């Protein structure tokens, strides 16, 4: 339980003993590029640090063992971070994403706590024994803010201040400390931001700050030092170490800095996912981002109705609620060029085409159970899942076919081949037994319909098209939707091809995807880097959903599957007995068909070779 001073500099985290004169050592870390923000857990002597250049948060024991990345995705500049040693939680702030997030100390159950009207949150301090967290905001109007450790009742504590750093709590004396990088002061106040006092005014460049016993410790970037002085008088100064340029953070490794108790410490509040300290009532139960807290206030429920949108190297999820929950990146590894996404509502699994690997991959939203459904002259261009028959209908840019594969990877076969066919975008309609696709023949783009076995093929549209690259449909309204990236517009029509109408053609730069959510049609504008939606009832206006999203690739809405309605489909029960293709006719009855390389047997159910 010796007192240690830890500081971050360059790619190292180094250690200074505060009790023995003879002690300077580097923590044996591997693979760190820029060690910024430091904290620790008194429970297990683990140290935590963020990396501005790696855009990660990591942890390890002080002897360098059990190096672990706990946060990897969705970080831009994680300059603030703090361990909740009572609730066993990890808080951090990102000045790039303008977010303050929480997760378990192993990174599980990541949730966003502050995301609105937040400009450059940088320095974070936690008081779990009281239920408050404090942070500094940079930006146009810098301030020191306060909130509960669940993000609620956010308030501005100290409005007149420059860019403050090294926000530190003196738990014994109930005082806040910080450096001001604009006034070049070290200041102190009470927990309410009152009784403000300048502790040191003669420092040329104070940056980092911490407190131990009757001393405060700071770093000066002009003096290249870690220095220490009386926390009350500012005197009794001593230089802990010099010739240390650009120390990012200092931290006191001692149990006195992590003491006290709250309800989360004794029982985790019995919460399933997150126990968050709050001032009044002690604690509330939290949930991972987009999850719902149940009626018991103890257990969480994952969203069943959400919006997925993908970039070149990311697949994101957002919900449509009224607290305007933020969009999150799904922690999915090895994404290189995502060009199309889909979702299976039955097994709750995410599907996408990566055209760098020329594969159809599938995973869960946590990135687990990664599976390759289609692999190597294979060039998947678009995909659409038949959720009842458990097939993927996907287009192949190399062989110019429409191929069908089951979700587990077993090949059904090709249902469309053609000399001059260029099948690119595709949406299935298993409810009516048809599929819709674009034919990007040079000098004659087309939107076509066919049955899910290739028969009954007809051209619905062959004019007023330049590059129809995205398709959507809705079986209840009987409507088909598409976006033309060259004509820069979105159209719709009946599934029969009647009532073709232009939905939107103004202020669209390059629409490359679209999807339908109830009465709302969403699309992504790659060049304009935004998501937009229009109310198809005409009631509400065209709304900008999110902007500044680069490399947009696809967008896909997911509605909670109604299992009673699902099992009412005849092809959901043993494919209707069909070996390969189960089809729905106008009679609502089931018929079986085959891929192009098989023929239907006299069993009226099974496919065989010619």
């Amino acid at each position: 339980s010796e007192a240690f001073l830890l500081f971050s500099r360059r790619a190292d985290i180094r250690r200074i003993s505060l009790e023995t004169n003879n002690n300077n050592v580097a923590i044996p870390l591997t693979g760190v590029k820029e060690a910024s923000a430091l904290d620790f857990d008194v429970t297990d002597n683990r140290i935590y640090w963020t990396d501005i250049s790696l855009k990660t948060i990591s942890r390890a024991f002080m002897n360098g063992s059990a190096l672990e990345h706990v946060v990897e995705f969705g970080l831009d500049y994680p300059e603030g971070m703090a361990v909740d040693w009572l609730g066993k939680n990890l808080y951090w702030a990102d000045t790039g994403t303008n977010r303050i997030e929480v997760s378990k100390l192993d990174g599980q159950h990541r949730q966003v706590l502050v995301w609105k009207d937040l400009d450059s949150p940088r320095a974070l301090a936690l008081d779990p024994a009281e239920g408050f967290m404090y942070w500094t905001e940079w930006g146009g109007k810098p301030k020191i803010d306060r909130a509960a450790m669940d993000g609620s009742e956010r308030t501005t504590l100290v409005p007149n201040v420059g860019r403050a750093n090294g926000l530190t709590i003196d738990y014994a004396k109930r005082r806040l400390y910080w450096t001001d990088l604009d006034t070049n002061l070290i200041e102190s106040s009470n927990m309410l931001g009152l009784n403000r006092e300048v502790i040191a005014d003669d420092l040329p460049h104070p940056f980092g700050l911490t407190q131990y016993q009757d001393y405060i410790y700071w770093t000066d970037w002009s003096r290249r030092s870690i220095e220490r002085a009386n926390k009350t008088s500012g005197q009794n100064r001593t230089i802990i170490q010099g010739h240390l340029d650009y120390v990012m953070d200092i931290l006191v490794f001692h149990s006195s800095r992590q003491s006290g108790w709250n309800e989360c410490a004794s029982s985790n509040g019995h919460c399933s996912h997150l126990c968050l300290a709050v001032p009044v009532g002690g604690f509330v139960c939290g949930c991972p981002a987009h999850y719902s807290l149940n009626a018991d206030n103890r257990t969480c429920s994952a969203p069943t109705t959400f919006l997925l949108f993908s970039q070149k190297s990311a697949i994101n999820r957002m919900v449509i609620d009224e607290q305007q929950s933020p969009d999150i990146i799904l922690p999915i590894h090895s994404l290189r060029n995502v060009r199309a996404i889909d979702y299976d509502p039955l097994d709750k699994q995410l599907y996408w085409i990566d055209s760098r690997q020329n594969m159809i991959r599938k995973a869960q939203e946590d990135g687990s159970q990664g599976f390759t459904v289609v692999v190597s002259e294979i060039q998947p261009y678009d995909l659409s899942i038949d959720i009842y028959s458990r097939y993927i209908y996907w287009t192949c840019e190399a062989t110019n076919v429409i191929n069908v594969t089951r979700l587990d990877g077993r090949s059904v076969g090709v249902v469309l081949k053609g000399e001059q066919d260029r099948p690119r975008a595709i949406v299935v309609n298993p409810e009516k037994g048809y599929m819709y696709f674009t034919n990007l023949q040079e000098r004659s783009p087309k939107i076509e319909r066919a049955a899910l076995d290739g028969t009954e093929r007809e051209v619905l549209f062959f004019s007023g098209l330049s590059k129809p690259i995205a398709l959507a449909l809705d079986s209840r309204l009987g409507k088909l939707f598409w976006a033309d990236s060259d004509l820069r517009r979105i159209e719709s029509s009946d599934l029969s091809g009647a009532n073709r109408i232009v939905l939107e053609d103004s202020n669209i730069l390059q629409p490359v995807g679209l999807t339908v959510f109830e009465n709302w049609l969403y699309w992504i504008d790659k060049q304009q880097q935004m998501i937009e939606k229009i109310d198809m009832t005409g009631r509400e206006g065209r709304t900008k959903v999110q902007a500044r999203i680069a490399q947009l690739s696809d967008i896909h809405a997911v509605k909670e599957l109604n299992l009673q309605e699902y099992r009412q489909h005849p092809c959901a029960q043993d494919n209707g007995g069909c070996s390969h293709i189960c089809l729905v006719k106008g009679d609502g009855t089931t018929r079986c068909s085959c891929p192009m390389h098989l023929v239907l047997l006299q069993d009226e159910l099974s496919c065989g070779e010619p």
């Binding site: 910024s36 501005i52 250049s53 500049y77 300059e79 000045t95 790039g96 400009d119 450059s120 940088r122 940079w138 930006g139 146009g140 860019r163 990088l181 970037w221 650009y246 990012m248």
Partner: peptide, 14 residues
């Protein structure tokens, strides 16, 4: 090489 720079929105390499 990079030197840390205090900006309006945080510390950045510049």
């Amino acid at each position: 090489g990079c030197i840390p720079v205090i900006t309006t929105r945080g510390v950045r390499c510049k």
